[model samples]
Target chain A: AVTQSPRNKVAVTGGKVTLSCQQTNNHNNMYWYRQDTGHGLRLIHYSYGAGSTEKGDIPDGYKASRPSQEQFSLILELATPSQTSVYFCASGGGRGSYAEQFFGPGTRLTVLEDLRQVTPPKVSLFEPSKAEIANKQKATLVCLARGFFPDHVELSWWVNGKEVHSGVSTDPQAYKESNYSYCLSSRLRVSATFWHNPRNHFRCQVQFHGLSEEDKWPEGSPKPVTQNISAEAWGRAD
Target chain B: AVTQSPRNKVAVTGGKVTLSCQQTNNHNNMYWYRQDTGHGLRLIHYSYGAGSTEKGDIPDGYKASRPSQEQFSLILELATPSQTSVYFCASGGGRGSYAEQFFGPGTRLTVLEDLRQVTPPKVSLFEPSKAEIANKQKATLVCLARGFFPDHVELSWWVNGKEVHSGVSTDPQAYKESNYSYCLSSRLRVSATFWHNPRNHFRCQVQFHGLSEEDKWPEGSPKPVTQNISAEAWGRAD
Candidate 1:
């Protein structure tokens, strides 16, 4: 069993990044690899047991450490855009020619040119258009986060202050604007009965990172847009 | 169009090896990548044009040179076993995000601990077992090359001094023996009428490398075993 921390990360150029990994299988060999576009995964470094690190095929600009039996880490001393790729960690089983390696769900790291230029996304939540209200009995809410720089965002839906997971679909890829910024849209479908209830509150949250000076995220929490459903819109559909 | 020379290569530890690639597409960018087990291809070096070579994600223990617009070479000044992998050369089509890359087939390079320990494979050709002679109208010949060190060989069949290409199947993977050497097998199926002809002479040829003090291979040409179908084998089936 292997797990990688910071599944999605953003790093500034020349900054330090530490990608951590944990394995419960107690295997002696743990490996780190990175996969990039138009290429296959390539090994970076691997360790055998604790305190025994070895260089892999590509060991430049990276360092690896195995401090304990369960933990391994890949450290980037000076992160660059070329090093921005999906990194994988695996624990190898047995010492045979056909030994199998258990892999963790990769960590995607993005290296920005500069963190000072990081732009926070502006979130906007909206109900379906007037045509949908008059013709259909179902209701769908749209959440749009626009003008985000570096194009790394997480959008989610909340109903009555609780999270919503089901009946929600987010765009697989961001839409790039002409100004080099990006826009993302997510939709939440609901029943007309639930939408017509005026007491029900809907909220869309946009999670963006690397906006502040100290990386203290508590003060710069998720930007949320909450709106109450309108009873007048249901009058036409009813 | 892209092509790689010395499609298969063998190198010794601490030796120098250079992989050459040529592209006729006149593209502005060319790339070098290596692929290994349990990982995708990893970029090693890329060149924008002639006299412009840039380091890729993994540039350790590797050097790249672009002498002309159509030629790019990856040089290993000190080769090691970890550097043994299949290498790919590609030429980029455009400068877009989704630019298509035209790739060559690939070159498989094997690095040995010492060239003096190389062992040449022994070639053997055999007819099908007696059970097939009496029951089937088809005939199959088996070629087995056993006890080969480093496990790199090319086996082919020739009929009357001409190479045969049809109805041939070679084992996709080499079989590792208990002694750490390898064995490989290939089969050639022929019609009963063609096998019964006494004039037809079938030969199994094996081509292996890294067995000589010098690189001169004329004195160490392919090892071939030839045989003719015996009349007694066909008597039982007839």
Candidate 2:
């Protein structure tokens, strides 16, 4: 087993304080995480003995603390909506050639009265081709929106207000961009194959975290959206 | 911000100790991570403050700490080659409607040689194209591995010996299985368009957290091997 490095530095402030920790016992990797209503945190990736690494995700803010080679923690103080970030902590042992990771559920953080409203983009099928599509013609549907903040929104696919099972994808805005600016947009991508029936409508929906299961979009309606097609003859059918 | 439920129970034995912490700050969501080779830990993910999640990839053997909300962190007191894992910590803050995250690097853990070798299938990669094709033909590549004591390793992808730039299309592993049989694995996914020309060559490389640079793949590789994709591809080409 390897050893953990010494705790070198720490920073804390009033209102809220986070403690981060780490260890290198087996030389494997580990992760820890937390989240909030409008925000959350996830423990993503990790490594195993000597040579490995994994990834992590966020729904809320997180703080990582490793007091020794065999211990670690994430701390949150003075909990506020602005301090709501997913917190994640993780560890692992080494394998010959692969990197597997373990994960923690997540912590959700939110501040009352400080929540902001942002409109997520709506996505729909652009157009499909008229020809008999051979072999699945796969493509991605993307929805981009601006004038949003906190980046706390969900991306979903809908078929007439009923949620669809199509894979949903999401991404954060660039750090260089200002959050208050209208240029910040949330993006969602979905993958699907070509079909002859244009009636199979698809919609991408965005939902706020922690909010009750409320439909951000009215039933049977389409909003700002974009689509890319692998086949022609496809048009807005929703 | 939301509040995290404190853990009622914790288990540690055989020189293995695990700690779990969670918070419910309802604003921005971040990630959990650890630090090993350097003084600074790394960020894992930020849920974008709206329950949306993003993942981070570190280059060492570490596992994540999180199984549910209000809990995070896993540790191994007994160090062993087969018990090595990486550790990470992270956080995300929700402001306006966007989310931002912060992270600590990672810790390394390992077990002694007297320990039995972890079971096989420690690390493996799922074939790249099993999922249904999408309109844009977005494909995800996954890696899985298991088994290590004291966790100390790093995992990464190399396109021709050069690390790939992880932009927007990435997701951290979902920890749904935890049946401890002395076996563990981590998965990494990269969504790329099939039309991209350099698709045929990519390699996932793992290394110890603080080993000399000479221990890396393709021999004599640099720390944070960010370039030389062709070099890594050639090594794995056969």
Candidate 3:
């Protein structure tokens, strides 16, 4: 059995948060997860034993500590609205084919927005690799945006002036780096033969804090940190 | 909110079992999932609006019926031990960015194994594709095992009579086809240059009912429907 403390709590943006957990079963393994709509449940951290904590799939904006065999804690140094979700803690049956895990009732945490903590992301776009050209299949373009705060950013691909809806993949959650900044990557896949068109212009657009009135870019306008494929870069492929 | 019937159930091997679910929220999307160790929770089926059932990531050995807006059912025509797991039913907020899903308490299902329904699988091994060779990087060999009952089969890769563990990927679950037979695929990846050696032999081995005495192949023996890469295939690569 596992138990999590503070069933529901609210934290101001940039404020510290600590979520506690306890297991009476004396299990050697414990895990923390957050449930979101499109992302389902993403693992935040896990522990192999009393003093061994390890990062899970989504380790940004969160820290984990296991002080003893019966206790574990999840710490958020600076909580943000994007971090708001239902958190679950679980105790596992160690390692084996039939390993079972018991989950807690879950804790709901809501982080209020703070305009002061807002920071815009820096964006860059990269062309496909040489190997991709040799395959004569699909060509991939990479959109990397880093050094952002609050993990709020949207990346989109544009062919000439039209927005591309298909063949686009973006990170569901922005990764938190060591400096407490956020980074995200979005990829657009296009046909290799697309480069055959001399007039086709491929561009990457990144929007940060688009929903906030405090954003420097005005609402309803196509304000973005934009990058486009140069005429020379596409000519090299042909 | 979502509600599931039969919080706990036990089904006999080769018997019929039906799991029911209801959602009071009247949401348009409903989903069914089964939780298993190592494989985690896998989606079985989902319905959009009403009277529409779609296959999810893993759709085998189970049938779904969504008769109305509030109700969904998961049916198992012939239950097996591998299918024994905790089943979850959820009602989603329909299609959108913030589409939320309300999950029920989940139903624990225990399917007792029956030896009478056991059947062996037919195995085959395939050489790397021409497209794979054109990449000039890694070469892949596919092992397909089909026509098995009870959905239990283990596939392994070997090179020159020794087992190869790394760079091997196997299906988490055997896919159940329309005729109620199981099919599974396993892939072994090796450097493209490895095929240049004519002496090297690649083998795909499939084991069925390895833990049971009723199996035709005796225990502690290499009882597998095995296929090996022919010398002619390697010579062509060279």
Candidate 4:
């Protein structure tokens, strides 16, 4: 569940705004997004505010503020009628129709936030490798979100596309990079029964804040370890 | 299994020449959607070649020519340095990347194709309503992808996120709308055993072109014709 945030805003009243957009009680963590009709919504900037004005993707049009405080503002130093309106400032808290978020951080904001639909991550499903898969051992397969960005990523393991639970362990938190890029990984340990079922797809997918570049993974992997369905071990239904 | 079509694209290799894109062996009914980053992958254009110059949604500079044919081509009238790499064409015809696709038609001289990202289909989930606690009768629930365009939506039945093999049925083909929007549905049925199990999530999803939207279903759903599990039946191997 997520909290509420405002939207479909038109801010023409731009200025040297002390604009600070904090995503709710995200503590010192804050985000920066902008909205324009044809442009939809986009996260122009964000910051731990670690270093005064941490630059963002759009280059130098906006500067971020974080002094243990802030609402992200579109300071209209050169405020033009096209750039200024009833500039309302607040946090990029949630995806609000004035209120709501089914999932994801603080509701997902439409303001000072960008929902750049990112591509799914490349999934590298490890193989049983030189070691042949035997029913006797814990079958290990790793599912990872490869070449993705913006730490907000979700990696899940699927056995034939249906979500796999339990015998699976995933990074409760995503692993981040200096660029804020990320890769989350999970482990799948299934028993003999599932291995015996020859399913078409075994995959790992990363739903990200963004997909970096295409990878060696489509989050699709093969049954790298095809177990021998020996008659004695032939089984069905748990 | 969905079939594959060769993007047997026409390579003009000329500055102001014509091009062609055809998918041979398209046999059964097929789909056409454009892929872009800004708005994720959207069906901005479609044609079984089923209609018009089929000139779909592209900015002023790119009005692709569809001369009552299929997929392939390129026409660079002015061939400016800026628009040189503006267009890219590919397909999810089978959601296959291990294999590749090629081809597509005209993009007039100066228009920039503004690609936008849009999440796929909204799904609606109905509850496993109506049925006595006796678990003597079959229980059914329906899941559907609603208000989506471009007719190529895939629906599947999942119980607690796993594929349901029995008592499950899905639309052989997605249902359509008068103006091109589509709705696809799947039904999941359960007998006493599952009816008695209190699994919080019994859901279905829509996997379109390439991205799999959580479906309106996971974004949330319907009620309890609560078939009470009076203790005696509460006990079973999970």
The most accurate candidate by lDDT is: 1
Candidates' RMSD to native: 17.8, 25.2, 24.5, 30.9
Interface CA RMSD of each prediction in angstroms: 10.2, 11.5, 8.6, 14.8
TM-score for chain B of each model, two decimals: 0.78, 0.33, 0.46, 0.38
Q: DockQ for the candidate 3 complex?
A: 0.02
Q: List, residue by residue over A1-238, the lDDT tens digit for candidate 4.
A: 1122322121122333334333444434344444332332244454444444444434245555555444433443433334321222323222111111111122211112222322234556663533555445554566666545333345666666477776777864556543424566777777556655654346665554322232112354431111111101122344
Please tell me which model should have the higher DockQ, number 1 or number 3. Answer: 1
User: Candidate 2: misplaced stretches above 4 Å?
Assistant: A1-84, A89-103, A108-140, A158-178, A181-196, A210-238, B1-238
Instruction: At residue A168, give the lDDT of candidate 2.
Output: 44
Please report the candidate that would top TM-score against the real structure.
1
The global Cα lDDT (0 to 1) of model 2 is 0.37
Query: In candidate 1, which residue ranges exceed 4 Å CA deviation?
Result: A1-238, B94-99, B130-139, B178-180, B211-238
Tens digit of per-residue lDDT, candidate 4, span B94-163 = 2111012222331222222211112247777665544546564343666777665444445666566566
TM-score of chain A of each: 0.69, 0.36, 0.47, 0.38
- The best candidate in terms of DockQ: 1
Model 1 docking grade = incorrect
Per-residue lDDT tens digits for candidate 1, residues B1-238, read: 8888767776778888889999989988888888776565677888877999877767999999999999999999999999998888888642211115667767878887755445667777777775746775343888888777666667777877778899888776568774547898888888766777766777777776544333323344352222221111221132
